[PDB]
Curated annotation (Swiss-Prot):
One of its GO terms (molecular function) is electron transfer activity. Heme c binds at C12, C15, H16, M61. Binds 1 heme c group covalently per subunit. Keywords: Electron transport, Heme, Iron, Metal-binding, Periplasm, Signal, Transport. Changing M22L: In strain: 221. Electron donor for cytochrome cd1 in nitrite and nitrate respiration. Its main location: periplasm. It is found in: Periplasm. The chain holds residues 23 to 104 of 104 of the full protein. The keyword Hydrolase does not apply. GO terms for cellular component: periplasmic space. This is Cytochrome c-551. The lineage of its organism: Bacteria, Pseudomonadati, Pseudomonadota, Gammaproteobacteria, Pseudomonadales.
Length: 82
């Protein structure tokens, strides 16, 4: 259930990367712009449940399979990485 095991178990590493951008934003890019800030955790949690349109690059993201407890652990891991 942790962000390191959920990034490899769920289909997030297919489009996203750990350092450089592949098609959308990378884990190092979302942590550099939003480094543990209130408001960004709610926008990143609502973006994975509904979808993002024009924020990091030209490619959009569809609504991924994630619950309220998984969106809070994934939002806190992308803001503060291990
Ligand atoms: C390719 C089909 C993707 C997969 C699979 C996942 N994501 Fe994604 N994500 C993708 C793009 C192209 C973008 C940028 C969209 C834009 O308009 O710029 C994103 C963005 C995110 C974000 C940031 C949202 C924001 O800043 O508002 C997060 C937090 C994010 N993606 C998370 C995420 C997770 C947890 C995934 C596995 C369940 C996942 N993404 C898969 C493209 C793709």
């Amino acid at each position: 259930q942790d962000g390191e095991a959920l990034f490899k178990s769920k289909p997030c590493a297919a489009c996203h990367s750990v350092d450089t951008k592949m098609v959308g934003p990378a884990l190092k890019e979302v942590a550099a712009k939003n480094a543990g800030v209130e408001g960004a955790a709610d926008t990143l949690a609502l973006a994975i449940k509904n979808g993002s349109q024009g924020v990091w690059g030209p490619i959009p993201m569809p609504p991924n399979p994630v619950t309220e407890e998984e969106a809070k652990i994934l939002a806190e891991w992308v803001l503060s990485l291990k």
